[PDB]
């Protein structure tokens, strides 16, 4: 059948695939590389620009754009050759063909969806195209009708509340707290051992460092005290260039900011405290369901100890007469894309789709007008 | 084609599943099956939800043999018998588990 | 895990993403769906003569005749 | 002539069990939904 | 990755892996019966 | 032989079952919910509106309309979900297999009838149905002929005069100030201790409050000098968000006001007075008699400690060389349905049924000439 793509433009990774896969057939970063030097050789089949796994590999002669930021995309060009990779290279296959799902972060730009919309209508031809928010997603991968969903990205963190599938708008959080500033603040804490990481082609080495040592504190100043007086807690990482740096409490610092936003100097409360003030803005009747269902989703969520810390920290938040669960499941860092295998495989969401017989008719304000 | 498969797990009120069961059941005294630590047919959770193990009329224990007798006409080896038995049995215990 | 055992039997039976990928997740009433399909499919290329048994009573009794 | 005979057609019953949001399609598509049960199945089939 | 289930899951599992099971033996049985019928033979056609 | 079903449709509950049962089938609250909520999550075998149990459960999703206030029917494509719920799924009954009686307070609108009669044969299509006031029932429940009853619910209050079987018409009064305006004269006071109720989602928490912590005063105003020396006088409970609230000076200040209504800028006085003026335009043969059988009714006179309350007042106003007696047995919150099932259960009763062929040859009125 011409089943549906699954396609979570996200911001950092795309992760790409068909529905009914139970994970994508492509995960790679959605990085556009450009060479920073004048290219030397003559005759050579030249390539002027890299998309993706090629940007990984060549950084070293480089210059890395992100062209998604805080799930905004904002170089349409740029935005354009990552999609022309997707379909064209990654997943190798011709997009009038057949219908693609989109993602998308919560409360965004209207002009956001309208300029997707058009270049998936008129460049790519795509027959049929919908956006879906990234936390609803979560819900049908981690089997629930009633959450709240902690939903956090390379690009941006967000809160979504969900009771029995009505999702509750003015409660939706969300935060520019993400994957991407606890990696340049990995930076910004690194140069305290004298180590230096200050170009484009050397940042994905940091966000690298960070994934493998990386742990949260139950409790901080506690395990602050104890990696200041023992080095039984210190790692030892390898550089590319076979140099050797070594790490101790510096590795559970960066992830206390999403706690702590005052450390990167935000105002914003960050994740346990956005997750009970949006809990808080429902309605009374609900906030128990709630209180049982939190789910982790999204990347950001992986560090070991965080499930813990969220459910201790919460319950210093909640009433004694409460019982407080974190879900946690080990499959969570593609659970976005995972929702969106079972949404768009939902015979019931069959009706749901923009058609460019729709859009043709109706012109790019159709977004907001149809679908969700 | 269309097999009911989800009889072998699920039986309404005074159902069966299917008669091999009941047969091998039946045959728990016959030395052969000593090994297969079979049990009457209401010991296992697949037999038993039915509430109703003996077909009045019917010796599952003589249904056996006739089955024994045919898969020999067939040339179905005794080992493959076995094999086929040892399975099932291992279906039975499995279903208590 | 079963694929490992101890007699002949066991391997042998599961012998001849993938079709028998999907089929492992395939639902009940999926599979019955197909396998309808397969039975139509078979009979479509062929042409049909029909029988029809009938059960005259519920005692098993010789030439006896239930109209109910 | 073949307008005389008048076809009796249960399509409509095979397309109310077998198509798509029939009554099997509105099964399968509730097993996946997350906490799905007999009776928002039996909802579905009132409200299709 | 490698993740726990719920007993529902578990006991659907052990109940799906009983019921493929039972099938496919079901289907070996049926193949030595086909071994023990068939012959080399070229069959021109056949009545089902 | 056919039953008929005993359904007091009240206000604020619904009370069903058969003829000749001792408790009823069914008690739910007279209750149509609708969504406000977004609908966001696709395929979710959402349904348009709730009745009963079903619209409380699900209560922070909603709005909550009850169609009936003051015994009076407002909206009739609400109520008749109710009476549907009733009888196809609650009681598991069609009503088109046998007759129906049903209930009403006094006083209330000519119209409200002529609706019922016309939805009951029109579109229910009943056999055979009767009305019968409330507090009638109360008396052949509590096993006696003569009385004055107050049958006190949600939404409306009443006495009703009856000497041996015989109605006193000129000496009804009825009383709106009901179980109701307690819960919203509860929200109207616990706005004082801080806590917080405006929503109709939270107003179901606010009447389970009343049901459980509160009782009736002997006397209000050595209480209201009592609740500045006391905190034993203060009872605690858990809210569904886990709160523990606690609440002291109003549990008299609200349950109260059925003793007496100046509070809320309304003329008339309170159920005290209007029992004893209800006495005072009874015929002058009969006053022993009836200060001797007050019969309490519906579940409004509960509360623990009201049978001395009412003892107190109308002794206070009537010579105490008259004797007052108040009938509150336990089984008071039902006895309006009891007293219907013993009554549609008599060989002698069966006569008074209007049936469908009555309706259609005379129209709506009929009510008006062969009931009360």
Redesign the interface.
């Given at each position: 059948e011409t089943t549906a793509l699954v396609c979570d433009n996200g911001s950092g990774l795309v992760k790409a695939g068909f529905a009914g896969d139970d994970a994508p057939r492509a995960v790679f970063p959605s990085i556009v590389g450009r060479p920073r030097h004048q290219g030397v050789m003559v005759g050579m089949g030249q390539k002027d620009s890299y998309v993706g796994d090629e940007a990984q590999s060549k950084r070293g002669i480089l210059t890395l754009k992100y062209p998604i930021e805080h799930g905004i995309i904002t170089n349409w060009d740029d935005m354009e050759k990552i999609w022309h990779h997707t379909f064209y290279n990654e997943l190798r296959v011709a997009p009038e063909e057949h219908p693609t799902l989109l993602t998308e972060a919560p409360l965004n730009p209207k002009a956001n969806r309208e300029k997707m919309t058009q270049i998936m209508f008129e460049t790519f031809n795509v027959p049929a195209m919908y956006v879906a928010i990234q936390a609803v997603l979560s819900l049908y991968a981690s089997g629930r009708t009633t959450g709240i969903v902690l939903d956090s990205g390379d690009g941006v963190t967000h809160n979504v509340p969900i009771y029995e599938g009505y999702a509750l708008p003015h409660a939706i959080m969300r935060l520019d707290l993400a994957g991407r500033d606890l990696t340049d603040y990995l930076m910004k804490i690194l140069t305290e051992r004298g180590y230096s990481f200050v170009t484009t082609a050397e940042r994905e080495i940091v966000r690298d460092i960070k994934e493998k040592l990386c742990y949260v504190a139950l409790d901080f100043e506690n395990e602050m005290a104890t990696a200041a007086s023992s080095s039984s807690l210190e790692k030892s990482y390898e550089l590319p260039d076979g140099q050797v740096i070594t790490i101790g409490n510096e590795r559970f610092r960066c992830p206390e900011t999403l706690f702590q936003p005052s450390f990167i100097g935000m105002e914003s409360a960050g994740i346990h405290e956005t997750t009970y003030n949006s809990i808080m803005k429902c309605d009374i009747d609900i906030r128990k369901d709630l209180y049982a269902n939190n789910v982790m989703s999204g990347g950001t969520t992986m560090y070991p100890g965080i499930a813990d810390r969220m459910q201790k920290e919460i319950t210093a938040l909640a009433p004694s007469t409460m019982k407080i669960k974190i879900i946690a499941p080990p499959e969570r860092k593609y659970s976005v894309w995972i929702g969106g295998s079972i949404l768009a495989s939902l015979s019931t969401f069959q009706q749901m789709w923009i058609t460019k017989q729709e859009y043709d008719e109706a012109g790019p304000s159709i977004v907001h007008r149809k679908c969700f | 084609?269309?097999?009911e498969?989800?009889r072998?797990?699920f039986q309404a009120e005074e159902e069966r599943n299917?008669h091999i069961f009941y047969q091998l059941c039946a045959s728990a005294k016959l030395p052969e099956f000593k090994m297969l630590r079979l049990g009457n047919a209401d010991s296992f959770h697949?037999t038993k939800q039915g509430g109703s193990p003996m077909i009045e009329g019917v010796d599952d224990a003589k249904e056996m043999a006739h089955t024994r007798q045919a898969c020999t006409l067939?040339?179905?080896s005794e080992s493959?018998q076995m094999?086929?038995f040892?399975?099932?049995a291992?279906?039975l215990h499995?279903?208590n588990? | 895990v079963l694929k490992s055992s101890k007699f002949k039997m066991l391997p042998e039976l599961f012998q001849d993403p993938g079709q028998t990928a999907k089929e492992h997740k395939k639902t009940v009433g999926h599979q019955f769906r197909n396998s309808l399909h397969l039975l139509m499919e078979t009979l479509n290329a062929t042409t049909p003569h029909y029988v029809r048994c009938i059960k005259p009573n519920d005692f098993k009794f010789p030439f006896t005749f239930d109209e109910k | 002539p073949w307008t005389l005979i008048d076809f009796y057609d249960n399509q409509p019953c095979i397309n109310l069990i077998e198509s798509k949001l029939g009554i099997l399609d509105l099964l399968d598509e509730e097993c996946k939904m997350p906490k799905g049960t007999d009776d928002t199945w039996a909802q579905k089939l009132y409200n299709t | 990755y490698i993740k726990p289930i719920s007993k529902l899951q578990a006991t659907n599992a052990r109940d799906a892996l009983a019921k493929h099971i039972y099938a496919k033996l079901f289907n070996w049985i049926v193949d030595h019966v086909n071994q023990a019928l068939h012959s080399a033979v070229k069959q021109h056609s056949f009545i089902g």
């Open positions: - | 084609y269309l097999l498969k989800s072998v797990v299917y697949y067939l040339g179905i493959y094999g086929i040892r399975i099932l291992g279906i499995l279903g588990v | - | - | -």
